[PDB]
Symmetry: C4
Subunit: 389 residues, 4 copies
């Protein structure tokens, strides 16, 4: 089989609600099912199949191991998948590797799986190519080495991946790894605005360029925006100039005074953001998602911009529709691409966390919206879970 | 692999009881299983395999989410399948897409999946070709856009599908979509008696003609009868003339006074009806199913007519046997075709709803009868479920 | 792929304990599993794979549907399988068809499935070739038409199957059906001792002859013994002459006075018996199983005879070992053949029924012994189920 | 497909934590899962896939059959597998054969499965090639005939396996079987220090030599060390000379006075030990695991030695890291090899037994560490199970 490359996108001018995976709809005390407790879900597709990934706390609902499940990192957390459309339960799932931070992607021939574990002060990125554990990468700032929580991107067999290391409250200067058949064949050190880049959501703008919309957990509600040239293996990063700030928390739209590079206020904390390309013959569409609340992880709106340059564009993104209403959880979001026979379908996935605090179970549904047809986005997504059951 | 075409039917002159799928036989409080709560099941087959589809309420029995499950449309309802012969449970099932109205069919190369969701006033038909979301179609009468709840039909790669839009109590003028590799390549606007057509059950009479037996939810207990010419992509609709009225409710057989086109009385409400062709070298068999009760969704009898013209034939259909006795639920029914090595097996499927009102769970078994051998239909089907358990 | 033929058996001179499938070891009230309630298990293999068949009461343990489960025939009973080695549970199982009497076999290219249902006075044998329902056969004595409860046997694409019809207490004159790609291409009417033949266990003695060891439910504890010539499609039946009477109940060995054809006493009732061939270059081995108790369904011993003629041989069979001790249930038993790369492995399977009467659940484990190596049979099989749990 | 041969190992200089399979994390009373009760897990891989084997007590947690589950041998114990990464539950598992001692391995074309059962005084090794039961081997010392509890090793189609027979407290003189397409084509009788060899962990040092690190259950805390020449099918055994005694219990490192062959003290009892080769172009790495406690089955450290000769090397092994801390169970350990596209990944697996005595359930998690990247081993493995739940 042949290496995959980004293709022209399938025809379409709007996203529509596609699929909800709400495994805790079957988690009642009165029920008989074992959905896995998870967070940081993402989706990645090869030629034939999409897989729904997540980071489990290796516990189920109903169950006795709720405690710790609101936590980020421990020695039990694993990267798991199911084929997309299956409920990720104890039995349907496969456990790929120990991980408290993840990524995966298909290169046309095989699956690369990425999982970070280790102690906070010296963590370790591991790479699996199919069945074989294949390579590692070491902590360079000795402070919670970390990856995308979304799909890596492969072209001509060469798979690119964002990592970062550093204080979540401070300086976290990201790197990219060029990976081929599961082995690291180079490190790319971005230039430009590089002081804090987290959890990049990356995809192909063309055969020459990968672009990522990332999270600054410390200094700004603007998303750092990566442009990675895969011909030269060089990357530059600058803040998104759009007045439609995509992070949460954030201040009012347009309120960050001054030129594109201005950090502004209300920039502490953050959330991973969805971002996907629509590649047309002579026009590029960029689709983004952000929370409906400016302050809390509630709701998710979808946004679009055709052409321009996200580094210098001060104008608003166009609100394309409400995916998750203000009354429903809107947590992490991510882009991915489904492979049709002759073209690529852009989609956004949304993690809808069931959050009842540290004294209950802590897990998530995943909602999916994809480019399809014409017109306007029509319907929002609810999880339907009562956390008391 | 090659596109499929309708073939000559396998030899046979009677249907026989084939298979019951009664997932709630494993739904007891005292039990350990998770059958999905569903309705509107149907079956569709490719060359190798049949799939058993249904519209889930995304809830299981036993479970805490019974409430709403008697309802028709909500934001949780999804199109699901299992391979035919598997119990559609939480874990065996795959979730294809968000849908409160569905259809699917195989074209010889791949599966097309159809699901309608959206608000009642502006609903949306979505199309999936394998993994890829592929096209949409918009509400044209802004009143619960709707589809077959049974298999679409593909020939030479071209897959045809009935939709309708309009008041369930009033005018609902249906359309057909010609779909190819998941994309709509034309709309067909039927002529003739077109004031209310719902939930058509369609199949091939030949390589030139698709025929459908549909439901009039407002004006008549006679079934509107579609004839769609796939060479010219044109369709005409007229009422079935048979005295053996196939809808429920209905008046006594023969009691609708006057010529073929007369609407008659007791025509308010309705039920989707099974219908399948037996294609022979020089004779066509049409098999239909209708409820044993004239008024309630109880029982299911099978009926046949060889040759003639359902638009002008006033004679009775021949009662071929009792599939479901008067004492057992007989809800929706549908036709489909199993692909043998060299010929096609016609079958009727019957949805047997467990109905205990809005304050209990609301789901369904599926019974299957197929053409096989000679003689007379021998045995009826019971679900065996006690809804108190 | 090519049609299968019986081959020379793999080397070996003894059977050994191979595999127990005891699905009710996971059926506790305190447990979380759903093993299917079943009886009449058998096993059949193609080139790649063996399937473990049984007739379910469409109920699980734990569950609310125990009542009726001791019964032989009803409208819920179905033929199911799993790949051999899997626990036949609600979810692992596939439901092939409605059946209260069954058989299956692979012809090298595809699976033929056989299931009888219908009313007692007019029952119906149904045939499925892969997915397609394909043929039927009608009741000829209008009294519980019935089949093998073990594998049919295919050669050169032609699959042979024993059926019978008649009073279980009286005259039940069996027939054979020659089936090809799921269609009956002839009926064979045996000659000879034909007054009562039930539940034949059949296999290949050579490319020319199929042989069966059957049950007489009325007149004798000797097993009727079929020899079917597949070149001429003719069959003759005579009683087994061996003093080692293989039925249960039975009188003491050797106590049936007079010549081979003598019926003797203690012949009322019966049990289906295991029987398998070991085909060697210039010697034929016949392996049989019978209960350790002469009167009750307790224990199972394995027996062998090389060469001779079972119709005229008065000598004892050689006791080869105890498969199930006197203290464990020994119910139906059956032969089958596993396909190695170049040769065929003969095996006997034993149904070990959990019998606590009509007021508890009624189901069965399956024990498997196969030809393997040299020496002497070493270990017996226990089910390990406490029916109180 | 072609026979497999040992290849050059994938690049790497350290092991890292890869994967935990902790099926009892889903075994709570309050939960809905059925993990199998097991012990003696091991892993074996073919070209495409790794399988996770174990010896079940044919019981689940939660369940009613805990009693006996601390025991070594009974008539219910079976060899089971799942694909590596799946939770071995009642439904995910396949049951290969009755066994209370096991082994498996892939030869490039098919799976060989090994299982010993029988009475203690006359036990029986059985061999399965795919589906077919294929050969047996008899007890030669009439005292619990036994095998590796880890993978056999195939080269050019020829698969080698260690067995032993004899008193666990006394003389147990092991043998090797050369097996080809499931049939024993020779016995190899080792020479040298042969008085007690148990549970050898074997792999390829090269195309010419298999090496094993075994357990002496009676006379020494030094591991007997096998070198098997596959060209000549001859084997010699001597004690490991290293001061880093790999058995448990053991005395202080270096305390066994005298030359390499000295037995020393604290040698009664034992544990099976992990051992895997790293084959380089002109250097051989040997990786071993031993318990952190000198006396109890607690913790697991990983060790390495490059080149030398384990029979004559008195020097210490290099401590490479702590896989399981002193506070966590460290029971059996084993080596295996994952097949990358062009090279072989060495790994160690560790059985982490949940031991609460004979009056609770007795089962095990499996931890996996593999060669991957550079540097130092970073993280230990905990099971996370509270046996009270
Ligand atoms: C990027 O490059 C790929 C690979 O070169 C392009 O895919 C080719 O597209 C043409 C049809 O336009 C096919 O005939 C070739 O078979 C494809 N090659 C491969 C290796 O798949 C793709 O069109 C390019 N994508 C862009 C420009 O967006
Ligand atoms: C409808 O058309 C199809 C396709 O042309 C017919 O199928 C052909 O049947 C002949 C044998 O009668 C085969 O040799 C061809 O291979 C078939 N073609 C294809 C593309 O499958 C089919 O017989 C027709 N069905 C009718 C008339 O009912
Ligand atoms: C019965 O007939 C079959 C089919 O003719 C025999 O199988 C053949 O065996 C030879 C080797 O002895 C192979 O070269 C052929 O390929 C086989 N043919 C087929 C169609 O499989 C088989 O040996 C015979 N069995 C007996 C005599 O017991
Ligand atoms: C052991 O022998 C095998 C088989 O001969 C060697 O595998 C060969 O390796 C070369 C490349 O180095 C390939 O071109 C061949 O296709 C391989 N042959 C087979 C049959 O796989 C292997 O390199 C040897 N392993 C060692 C020396 O460790
Ligand atoms: C402290 C660094 C954070 C990234 C900005 C942190 N990442 C990790 C790997 O711990 C994320 C953050 O704390 C949590 C969130 O914001 O939802 C999830 C959390 N992500 C994961 N648990 N994998
Ligand atoms: C109001 C329009 C009706 C069609 C005539 C209605 N269709 C939908 C899509 O809501 C059906 C009808 O109300 C119910 C029935 O008759 O059983 C099922 C119901 N079908 C579905 N829930 N999919
Ligand atoms: C009354 C005729 C009997 C055959 C001799 C009878 N067969 C059927 C099809 O009902 C069997 C017999 O009654 C029971 C037994 O002997 O175990 C099983 C039973 N077999 C099945 N339930 N399939
Ligand atoms: C008495 C001989 C022992 C080998 C040294 C013994 N082997 C068997 C087959 O019974 C092992 C030992 O008793 C137990 C242990 O040490 O953990 C496991 C146990 N292994 C198994 N139950 N398969
Ligand atoms: Ca921020
Ligand atoms: Ca009507
Ligand atoms: Ca008898
Ligand atoms: Ca020792």
């Amino acid at each position: 089989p042949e290496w995959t490359y980004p293709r022209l996108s399938c025809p379409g001018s709007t996203f529509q609600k596609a699929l909800l995976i709400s495994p805790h709809r079957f988690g009642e005390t009165k029920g008989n099912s074992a959905p896995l407790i998870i967070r940081e879900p993402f989706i990645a597709c090869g030629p034939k199949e999409c897989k729904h990934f997540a980071l489990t706390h290796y516990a189920a609902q109903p169950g006795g191991y709720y405690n710790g499940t609101r936590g980020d990192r421990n020695k039990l957390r694993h990267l798991i998948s199911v084929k997309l459309g299956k409920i990720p339960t104890v039995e349907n799932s496969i456990f790929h590797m120990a991980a408290w931070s993840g990524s995966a992607c298909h290169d046309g021939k095989e699956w690369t799986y990425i999982g970070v574990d280790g102690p906070d002060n010296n963590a370790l990125l591991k790479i699996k190519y199919g069945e074989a554990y294949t390579d590692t990468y070491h902590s360079y700032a000795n402070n919670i080495l970390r990856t995308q929580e979304s799909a890596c991107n492969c072209i001509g067999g060469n798979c690119y991946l964002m990592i970062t290391d550093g204080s979540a409250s401070g300086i976290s200067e990201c790197r990219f790894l060029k990976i081929r058949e599961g082995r690291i064949i180079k490190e790319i050190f971005p230039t430009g605005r590089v002081k804090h880049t987290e959890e990049c959501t990356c995809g192909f703008a063309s055969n020459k360029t990968i672009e990522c919309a990332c999270r600054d957990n410390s200094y700004t509600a603007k998303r750092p925006f990566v442009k990675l040239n895969v011909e030269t293996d060089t990357a530059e990063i600058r803040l998104m100039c759009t007045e439609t700030y995509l992070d949460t928390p954030r201040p009012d739209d347009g309120s960050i005074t001054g030129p594109c590079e201005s950090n502004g206020d209300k920039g502490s904390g953050g959330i991973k953001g969805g971002f996907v390309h629509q590649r047309m013959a002579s026009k590029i569409g960029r689709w983004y998602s952000r929370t409906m609340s400016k302050t809390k992880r509630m709701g998710m709106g979808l946004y679009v911009k055709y052409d321009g340059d996200p580094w210098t564009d001060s104008d608003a993104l166009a609100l394309s529709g409400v995916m998750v209403s203000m009354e429903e959880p809107g947590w992490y979001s991510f882009g991915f691409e489904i492979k049709d026979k002759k073209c690529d379908v852009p989609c956004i996935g949304i993690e809808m966390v069931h959050d009842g605090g540290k004294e209950t179970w802590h897990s998530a549904a995943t909602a999916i919206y994809c480019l399809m047809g014409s017109g306007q986005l029509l319907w929002d997504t609810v999880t339907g879970v009562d956390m008391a059951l």
